[PDB]
Each structure stands twice: as C-alpha cells, then as structure tokens.
Write a protein that binds this ligand. Sequence first.
Ligand SMILES: Nc1ncnc2c([C@@H]3O[C@H](COP(=O)(O)O)[C@@H](O)[C@H]3O)n[nH]c12
Length: 246
Amino acid sequence: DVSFRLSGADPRSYGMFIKDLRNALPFREKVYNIPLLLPSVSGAGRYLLMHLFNYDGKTITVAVDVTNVYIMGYLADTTSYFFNEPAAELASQYVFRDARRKITLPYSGNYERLQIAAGKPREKIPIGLPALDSAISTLLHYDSTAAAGALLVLIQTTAEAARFKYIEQQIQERAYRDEVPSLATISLENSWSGLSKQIQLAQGNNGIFRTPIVLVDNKGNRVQITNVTSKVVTSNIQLLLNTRNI
Ligand SMILES: Nc1ncnc2c([C@@H]3O[C@H](COP(=O)(O)O)[C@@H](O)[C@H]3O)n[nH]c12
C-alpha cells in the first residue's frame, strides 16, 4: 500500500508519494529504460491500495489495477464505491471485502463518462493539491454528481502523475493553489496508450515509431513524436502499458 497525507504536504513529499506509487507497480522488462507494465496479474495481487488522508486527517482507500494504473473504486468509511464497468466488478471480489455496503456509481470510470456526469470537461476543473484535499472530502460523503468531479481530480493527481513526469511537475507547481490543466496535460493523458504502443513497436525498428504520435505542447499546438529520442520518451513517460492490454 502507498500512502499520502495532505497535512504538511509540500512539493517534495508529493514527489515522494508519486515515486512510491510508480515503484509499487510490478514490471518484468524495461523498454528503452521505461518500466513495461505486466500483461495481467491475477488474484488480489492485481490491486494496489493507496491510502489518502486530507488536511484534517480523514481518509479514503483507493484501489488501482497495477496492470494499467486504472482507478477501479474506493472505500470511504464502511461503504465501498465502484465504477459501473466489468473490471471494477471483478475487482469488487478481491478488495474491500469488509465493507458494510457496496454502491456502484452510475457511470464507468473513463473520462468521457465522468465529464458528462460532472457537468464540466477536464479543462475546466482546477487540479492541484488543495483540489485533491477537497476531492477526498467529497468522496467521503456520497453524491454522484460531486463524486464525478472529485474522481476527475483524483485520477489526474495520482494515476496521471505516475504515468508522466510532466504532469507530476504540474501538480507540484499547484501545491498551494489550483489551476486547470494545460492542453499539454490533457494531450498527454489521452496519448498514454498510443505512446506506449509505439515505444514498444519501435524496438526492432531502430527506435522509430511505425506511426507518429501527435501531441500539443507547452507553448500551444500540434507536435509529432516520431522516434524514441524525443524528450517525451527520454524524460517524460514513466510507465508503459503492455501491448497485450491495448
Ligand atoms: N479510472 C481511471 N483511472 C486511471 N486512468 C484512467 C483513464 C485514462 O484515460 C486515458 C484516456 O482514455 P481514453 O483513451 O479512453 O479516452 C487512458 O490513458 C486511461 O488509462 N481513464 N479513466 C481512468
């Protein structure tokens, strides 16, 4: 289990939590020195528990699938809450057995469905470490409209920051003040599968991508990643989704 406490959190304890989250996910190989996540794990071993504490010290436990860093559900007090999708139901068999009741949230956990349920696209929700504290407080009391907005903050400040060093840095700049994500952060989030696939297929193709990944950058718009010497590959992406899961 990894843990993060927002009381007394600053940019470096947060980097320390994201470091431990990354280091808790099992891998067999490194492709171009990036951890390649396993095709499948079976049993309860497939799930990582993160214990998150807000400013006041209340907590929620979040369950993450270690093969893809996908947030499946969470436990708040005695109630477990799971996304309405097949993998989250499978997950409810291994985690939070101890809950007095299990509620299925009325949406799956992908971004389109959560934005629709929240009433705001990601681009309009301030993220940062104050927003994470808020999100933990919202998840402690069931409301599905407000839980969709809090889960969008929760995915990006934990799972997306683990996947990309650039997003982790974005959240460390937002440690005492929230701010909506840059288009670059949204671009990166959406490209993890694509980028993971091409870095994998680039082995045996001299580090060259079969098809270029296009991202918008930290100045404005439209950028094509064609090979593994790009800084996106050498410095930014931190975990790769196994091609068997794409
Ligand atoms: N519940 C969740 N927990 C973690 N990551 C995600 C995602 C991420 O959203 C990204 C973009 O998804 P789509 O390609 O389905 O739009 C993917 O990298 C996926 O892993 N959506 N929902 C998530």
